[PDB]
PDB file of C-alpha atoms in Angstrom:
ATOM      1  CA  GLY A   1     104.744 103.809 134.700  1.00  0.00           C
ATOM      2  CA  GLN A   2     108.166 104.340 133.138  1.00  0.00           C
ATOM      3  CA  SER A   3     107.854 106.065 129.777  1.00  0.00           C
ATOM      4  CA  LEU A   4     108.986 104.366 126.566  1.00  0.00           C
ATOM      5  CA  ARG A   5     111.652 107.004 126.026  1.00  0.00           C
ATOM      6  CA  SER A   6     112.940 106.586 129.591  1.00  0.00           C
ATOM      7  CA  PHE A   7     113.359 102.848 129.007  1.00  0.00           C
ATOM      8  CA  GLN A   8     115.090 103.456 125.649  1.00  0.00           C
ATOM      9  CA  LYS A   9     117.410 106.011 127.311  1.00  0.00           C
ATOM     10  CA  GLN A  10     118.258 103.637 130.165  1.00  0.00           C
ATOM     11  CA  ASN A  11     119.256 101.010 127.587  1.00  0.00           C
ATOM     12  CA  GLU A  12     121.408 103.500 125.692  1.00  0.00           C
ATOM     13  CA  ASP A  13     122.997 104.747 128.922  1.00  0.00           C
ATOM     14  CA  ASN A  14     123.765 101.211 130.080  1.00  0.00           C
ATOM     15  CA  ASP A  15     125.375 100.470 126.693  1.00  0.00           C
ATOM     16  CA  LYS A  16     127.569 103.574 127.116  1.00  0.00           C
ATOM     17  CA  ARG A  17     128.411 102.508 130.695  1.00  0.00           C
ATOM     18  CA  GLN A  18     129.411  99.075 129.357  1.00  0.00           C
ATOM     19  CA  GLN A  19     131.699 100.693 126.747  1.00  0.00           C
ATOM     20  CA  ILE A  20     133.391 102.895 129.353  1.00  0.00           C
ATOM     21  CA  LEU A  21     133.774  99.902 131.669  1.00  0.00           C
ATOM     22  CA  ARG A  22     135.309  97.780 128.883  1.00  0.00           C
ATOM     23  CA  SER A  23     137.965 100.494 128.451  1.00  0.00           C
ATOM     24  CA  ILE A  24     139.017  99.782 132.069  1.00  0.00           C
ATOM     25  CA  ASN A  25     138.853  95.997 131.575  1.00  0.00           C
ATOM     26  CA  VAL A  26     135.453  95.413 133.185  1.00  0.00           C
ATOM     27  CA  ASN A  27     132.958  93.315 131.206  1.00  0.00           C
ATOM     28  CA  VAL A  28     129.435  93.215 132.600  1.00  0.00           C
ATOM     29  CA  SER A  29     125.914  92.913 131.238  1.00  0.00           C
ATOM     30  CA  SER A  30     123.546  95.813 130.677  1.00  0.00           C
ATOM     31  CA  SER A  31     121.628  95.125 133.904  1.00  0.00           C
ATOM     32  CA  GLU A  32     124.875  95.216 135.911  1.00  0.00           C
ATOM     33  CA  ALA A  33     126.393  98.281 134.287  1.00  0.00           C
ATOM     34  CA  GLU A  34     124.954 101.066 136.444  1.00  0.00           C
ATOM     35  CA  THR A  35     126.082  99.575 139.774  1.00  0.00           C
ATOM     36  CA  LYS A  36     129.458  98.498 138.402  1.00  0.00           C
ATOM     37  CA  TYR A  37     130.011 101.961 136.893  1.00  0.00           C
ATOM     38  CA  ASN A  38     129.160 103.608 140.198  1.00  0.00           C
ATOM     39  CA  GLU A  39     131.571 101.244 142.055  1.00  0.00           C
ATOM     40  CA  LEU A  40     134.470 102.468 139.848  1.00  0.00           C
ATOM     41  CA  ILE A  41     133.786 105.852 138.194  1.00  0.00           C
ATOM     42  CA  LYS A  42     134.083 108.504 140.846  1.00  0.00           C
ATOM     43  CA  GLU A  43     134.663 111.746 138.859  1.00  0.00           C
ATOM     44  CA  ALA A  44     133.294 112.727 135.491  1.00  0.00           C
ATOM     45  CA  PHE A  45     133.931 116.176 134.036  1.00  0.00           C
ATOM     46  CA  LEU A  46     134.368 118.051 130.806  1.00  0.00           C
ATOM     47  CA  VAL A  47     137.650 119.777 130.048  1.00  0.00           C
ATOM     48  CA  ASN A  48     138.391 122.451 127.494  1.00  0.00           C
ATOM     49  CA  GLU A  49     141.419 122.491 125.154  1.00  0.00           C
ATOM     50  CA  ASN A  50     143.477 124.138 127.883  1.00  0.00           C
ATOM     51  CA  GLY A  51     142.798 121.248 130.312  1.00  0.00           C
ATOM     52  CA  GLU A  52     140.493 123.290 132.529  1.00  0.00           C
ATOM     53  CA  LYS A  53     137.294 121.844 133.976  1.00  0.00           C
ATOM     54  CA  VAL A  54     134.177 123.308 132.419  1.00  0.00           C
ATOM     55  CA  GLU A  55     130.550 122.881 133.458  1.00  0.00           C
ATOM     56  CA  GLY A  56     128.385 120.146 131.991  1.00  0.00           C
ATOM     57  CA  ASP A  57     127.314 116.579 132.685  1.00  0.00           C
ATOM     58  CA  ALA A  58     130.164 114.579 131.192  1.00  0.00           C
ATOM     59  CA  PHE A  59     128.265 111.314 130.869  1.00  0.00           C
ATOM     60  CA  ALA A  60     125.150 112.901 129.355  1.00  0.00           C
ATOM     61  CA  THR A  61     126.985 115.020 126.815  1.00  0.00           C
ATOM     62  CA  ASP A  62     127.268 113.670 123.273  1.00  0.00           C
ATOM     63  CA  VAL A  63     130.942 113.240 122.438  1.00  0.00           C
ATOM     64  CA  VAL A  64     130.730 114.610 118.904  1.00  0.00           C
ATOM     65  CA  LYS A  65     128.629 117.528 120.230  1.00  0.00           C
ATOM     66  CA  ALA A  66     131.188 118.198 122.939  1.00  0.00           C
ATOM     67  CA  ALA A  67     134.183 118.074 120.496  1.00  0.00           C
ATOM     68  CA  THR A  68     132.706 120.580 118.029  1.00  0.00           C
ATOM     69  CA  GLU A  69     132.424 122.945 121.036  1.00  0.00           C
ATOM     70  CA  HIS A  70     136.029 122.095 122.112  1.00  0.00           C
ATOM     71  CA  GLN A  71     134.873 120.203 125.223  1.00  0.00           C
ATOM     72  CA  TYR A  72     136.083 116.724 126.075  1.00  0.00           C
ATOM     73  CA  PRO A  73     134.763 114.353 128.754  1.00  0.00           C
ATOM     74  CA  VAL A  74     137.071 112.718 131.292  1.00  0.00           C
ATOM     75  CA  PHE A  75     135.853 109.825 133.486  1.00  0.00           C
ATOM     76  CA  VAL A  76     138.148 109.031 136.414  1.00  0.00           C
ATOM     77  CA  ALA A  77     138.041 105.523 137.803  1.00  0.00           C
ATOM     78  CA  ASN A  78     139.375 104.612 141.229  1.00  0.00           C
ATOM     79  CA  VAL A  79     141.091 101.266 140.695  1.00  0.00           C
ATOM     80  CA  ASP A  80     142.846  99.955 143.819  1.00  0.00           C
ATOM     81  CA  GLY A  81     143.044 103.553 145.141  1.00  0.00           C
ATOM     82  CA  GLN A  82     144.658 104.935 141.969  1.00  0.00           C
ATOM     83  CA  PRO A  83     143.161 106.966 139.186  1.00  0.00           C
ATOM     84  CA  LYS A  84     142.596 105.749 135.643  1.00  0.00           C
ATOM     85  CA  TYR A  85     141.658 108.516 133.190  1.00  0.00           C
ATOM     86  CA  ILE A  86     139.100 107.515 130.554  1.00  0.00           C
ATOM     87  CA  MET A  87     138.802 109.645 127.400  1.00  0.00           C
ATOM     88  CA  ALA A  88     136.200 109.620 124.643  1.00  0.00           C
ATOM     89  CA  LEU A  89     137.009 108.983 120.992  1.00  0.00           C
ATOM     90  CA  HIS A  90     135.103 109.860 117.819  1.00  0.00           C
ATOM     91  CA  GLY A  91     135.985 109.491 114.150  1.00  0.00           C
ATOM     92  CA  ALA A  92     135.236 107.995 110.768  1.00  0.00           C
ATOM     93  CA  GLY A  93     135.350 104.558 109.218  1.00  0.00           C
ATOM     94  CA  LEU A  94     134.721 103.143 105.781  1.00  0.00           C
ATOM     95  CA  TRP A  95     130.916 103.065 105.951  1.00  0.00           C
ATOM     96  CA  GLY A  96     130.042 105.280 108.886  1.00  0.00           C
ATOM     97  CA  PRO A  97     131.193 106.808 112.166  1.00  0.00           C
ATOM     98  CA  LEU A  98     133.519 105.254 114.716  1.00  0.00           C
ATOM     99  CA  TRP A  99     133.764 105.989 118.429  1.00  0.00           C
ATOM    100  CA  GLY A 100     135.269 104.494 121.564  1.00  0.00           C
ATOM    101  CA  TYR A 101     136.982 105.043 124.884  1.00  0.00           C
ATOM    102  CA  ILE A 102     140.582 104.713 125.976  1.00  0.00           C
ATOM    103  CA  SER A 103     141.945 104.764 129.503  1.00  0.00           C
ATOM    104  CA  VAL A 104     145.378 105.622 130.824  1.00  0.00           C
ATOM    105  CA  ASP A 105     147.213 104.887 134.041  1.00  0.00           C
ATOM    106  CA  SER A 106     147.954 107.530 136.673  1.00  0.00           C
ATOM    107  CA  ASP A 107     151.006 108.645 134.642  1.00  0.00           C
ATOM    108  CA  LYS A 108     148.548 110.097 132.065  1.00  0.00           C
ATOM    109  CA  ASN A 109     150.477 108.266 129.336  1.00  0.00           C
ATOM    110  CA  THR A 110     150.401 104.474 129.530  1.00  0.00           C
ATOM    111  CA  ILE A 111     147.231 102.918 128.143  1.00  0.00           C
ATOM    112  CA  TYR A 112     145.297 100.712 130.576  1.00  0.00           C
ATOM    113  CA  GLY A 113     142.495  99.581 128.210  1.00  0.00           C
ATOM    114  CA  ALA A 114     140.405 100.506 125.196  1.00  0.00           C
ATOM    115  CA  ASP A 115     137.043  99.908 123.523  1.00  0.00           C
ATOM    116  CA  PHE A 116     136.041 100.713 119.942  1.00  0.00           C
ATOM    117  CA  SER A 117     132.617 100.943 118.363  1.00  0.00           C
ATOM    118  CA  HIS A 118     131.117 101.692 114.967  1.00  0.00           C
ATOM    119  CA  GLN A 119     127.837 102.353 113.211  1.00  0.00           C
ATOM    120  CA  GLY A 120     128.128 100.163 110.145  1.00  0.00           C
ATOM    121  CA  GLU A 121     131.525  98.599 109.571  1.00  0.00           C
ATOM    122  CA  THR A 122     131.634  95.181 107.927  1.00  0.00           C
ATOM    123  CA  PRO A 123     131.567  91.910 109.916  1.00  0.00           C
ATOM    124  CA  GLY A 124     134.913  90.167 109.632  1.00  0.00           C
ATOM    125  CA  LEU A 125     136.643  93.269 108.250  1.00  0.00           C
ATOM    126  CA  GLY A 126     136.289  96.790 109.691  1.00  0.00           C
ATOM    127  CA  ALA A 127     133.906  95.586 112.414  1.00  0.00           C
ATOM    128  CA  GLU A 128     136.791  93.622 113.970  1.00  0.00           C
ATOM    129  CA  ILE A 129     137.895  96.806 115.747  1.00  0.00           C
ATOM    130  CA  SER A 130     135.201  96.029 118.337  1.00  0.00           C
ATOM    131  CA  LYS A 131     136.858  92.741 119.335  1.00  0.00           C
ATOM    132  CA  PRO A 132     139.387  92.229 122.152  1.00  0.00           C
ATOM    133  CA  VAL A 133     141.971  90.772 119.752  1.00  0.00           C
ATOM    134  CA  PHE A 134     142.233  94.316 118.369  1.00  0.00           C
ATOM    135  CA  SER A 135     141.752  96.475 121.461  1.00  0.00           C
ATOM    136  CA  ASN A 136     143.939  94.430 123.821  1.00  0.00           C
ATOM    137  CA  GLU A 137     147.026  95.398 121.806  1.00  0.00           C
ATOM    138  CA  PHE A 138     146.774  98.988 123.054  1.00  0.00           C
ATOM    139  CA  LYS A 139     147.425  97.978 126.663  1.00  0.00           C
ATOM    140  CA  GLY A 140     150.840  99.175 127.792  1.00  0.00           C
ATOM    141  CA  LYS A 141     151.385 101.443 124.788  1.00  0.00           C
ATOM    142  CA  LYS A 142     152.207 105.108 125.418  1.00  0.00           C
ATOM    143  CA  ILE A 143     150.604 108.237 123.948  1.00  0.00           C
ATOM    144  CA  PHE A 144     153.671 110.404 124.531  1.00  0.00           C
ATOM    145  CA  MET A 145     157.250 109.595 123.493  1.00  0.00           C
ATOM    146  CA  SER A 146     159.626 111.278 125.923  1.00  0.00           C
ATOM    147  CA  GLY A 147     157.160 114.116 126.409  1.00  0.00           C
ATOM    148  CA  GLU A 148     156.121 114.457 122.772  1.00  0.00           C
ATOM    149  CA  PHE A 149     152.490 113.715 121.858  1.00  0.00           C
ATOM    150  CA  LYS A 150     152.390 111.030 119.155  1.00  0.00           C
ATOM    151  CA  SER A 151     149.384 108.791 119.834  1.00  0.00           C
ATOM    152  CA  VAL A 152     149.532 105.089 118.878  1.00  0.00           C
ATOM    153  CA  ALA A 153     149.857 104.095 115.222  1.00  0.00           C
ATOM    154  CA  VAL A 154     147.796 101.367 113.577  1.00  0.00           C
ATOM    155  CA  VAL A 155     150.005  99.573 111.032  1.00  0.00           C
ATOM    156  CA  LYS A 156     149.537  96.956 108.345  1.00  0.00           C
ATOM    157  CA  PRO A 157     149.674  93.580 110.173  1.00  0.00           C
ATOM    158  CA  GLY A 158     153.220  92.500 111.072  1.00  0.00           C
ATOM    159  CA  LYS A 159     154.829  95.889 110.370  1.00  0.00           C
ATOM    160  CA  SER A 160     156.480  98.429 112.663  1.00  0.00           C
ATOM    161  CA  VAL A 161     157.112 102.137 113.245  1.00  0.00           C
ATOM    162  CA  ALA A 162     160.334 103.306 114.921  1.00  0.00           C
ATOM    163  CA  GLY A 163     159.933 106.077 117.502  1.00  0.00           C
ATOM    164  CA  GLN A 164     156.195 105.657 118.093  1.00  0.00           C
ATOM    165  CA  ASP A 165     154.143 102.887 119.722  1.00  0.00           C
ATOM    166  CA  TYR A 166     151.948 100.929 117.345  1.00  0.00           C
ATOM    167  CA  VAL A 167     149.503  98.059 117.047  1.00  0.00           C
ATOM    168  CA  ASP A 168     148.427  95.882 114.153  1.00  0.00           C
ATOM    169  CA  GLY A 169     145.419  96.861 112.099  1.00  0.00           C
ATOM    170  CA  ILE A 170     142.833  94.529 110.617  1.00  0.00           C
ATOM    171  CA  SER A 171     143.650  92.351 107.612  1.00  0.00           C
ATOM    172  CA  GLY A 172     141.335  93.493 104.819  1.00  0.00           C
ATOM    173  CA  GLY A 173     140.221  96.431 107.002  1.00  0.00           C
ATOM    174  CA  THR A 174     142.811  99.031 106.149  1.00  0.00           C
ATOM    175  CA  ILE A 175     140.484 102.077 105.760  1.00  0.00           C
ATOM    176  CA  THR A 176     138.781 101.306 109.097  1.00  0.00           C
ATOM    177  CA  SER A 177     142.198 100.708 110.742  1.00  0.00           C
ATOM    178  CA  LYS A 178     143.442 104.063 109.398  1.00  0.00           C
ATOM    179  CA  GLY A 179     140.232 105.591 110.708  1.00  0.00           C
ATOM    180  CA  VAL A 180     141.070 104.278 114.195  1.00  0.00           C
ATOM    181  CA  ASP A 181     144.623 105.660 113.956  1.00  0.00           C
ATOM    182  CA  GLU A 182     143.261 109.066 112.912  1.00  0.00           C
ATOM    183  CA  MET A 183     140.471 108.924 115.509  1.00  0.00           C
ATOM    184  CA  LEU A 184     142.981 108.321 118.284  1.00  0.00           C
ATOM    185  CA  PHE A 185     145.275 111.128 117.202  1.00  0.00           C
ATOM    186  CA  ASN A 186     142.532 113.669 116.538  1.00  0.00           C
ATOM    187  CA  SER A 187     140.482 112.802 119.614  1.00  0.00           C
ATOM    188  CA  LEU A 188     143.398 112.586 122.047  1.00  0.00           C
ATOM    189  CA  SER A 189     144.760 115.911 120.732  1.00  0.00           C
ATOM    190  CA  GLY A 190     141.905 117.653 122.558  1.00  0.00           C
ATOM    191  CA  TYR A 191     143.000 116.105 125.858  1.00  0.00           C
ATOM    192  CA  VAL A 192     146.704 116.909 125.581  1.00  0.00           C
ATOM    193  CA  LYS A 193     146.730 119.914 127.948  1.00  0.00           C
ATOM    194  CA  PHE A 194     144.837 117.910 130.597  1.00  0.00           C
ATOM    195  CA  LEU A 195     147.281 115.023 130.156  1.00  0.00           C
ATOM    196  CA  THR A 196     150.363 117.265 130.429  1.00  0.00           C
ATOM    197  CA  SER A 197     149.053 119.325 133.385  1.00  0.00           C
ATOM    198  CA  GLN A 198     151.630 119.095 136.131  1.00  0.00           C
ATOM    199  CA  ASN A 199     152.113 120.585 139.621  1.00  0.00           C
TER     200      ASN A 199
END
């Protein structure tokens, strides 16, 4: 029959599929994730720091492993005939690693959706990054300001930054919130040449 490790892997893969799907505003259960993913995600490739496609299975490759080797996975969804570009995030929180996915519209700038995950952040505090009240704020924000890469800031609740898009962080979760801000900037930096590639 199916091996134990195959079943464990399928569960892990479906969890990853769910995360990627949530970044394009699709919320399905584990048992629905493979079909739903295949209905939407039509290209999946690694890019290097120069925005060039490089060999490797984008879905199978560990994001931290890819980033240390200066490789970055791009998943391209076909939503109503138009591409959404989904990028992988990795970083650090208060008590352990953070990761996530963020998608942009066909302009390679405007955020379409986002999903954030963590290993051991605290319920009600840093763990709140995994909730829609946090991630929904990224929708419509831009990574580039008139051509200049800035990423999206995470500010103390109720505050603002002039000249850069921003969202509120988590009350009582400032180190985790900062970790998300840094994760976005550092992770998206790898994708900049792909995002700015232009005919």
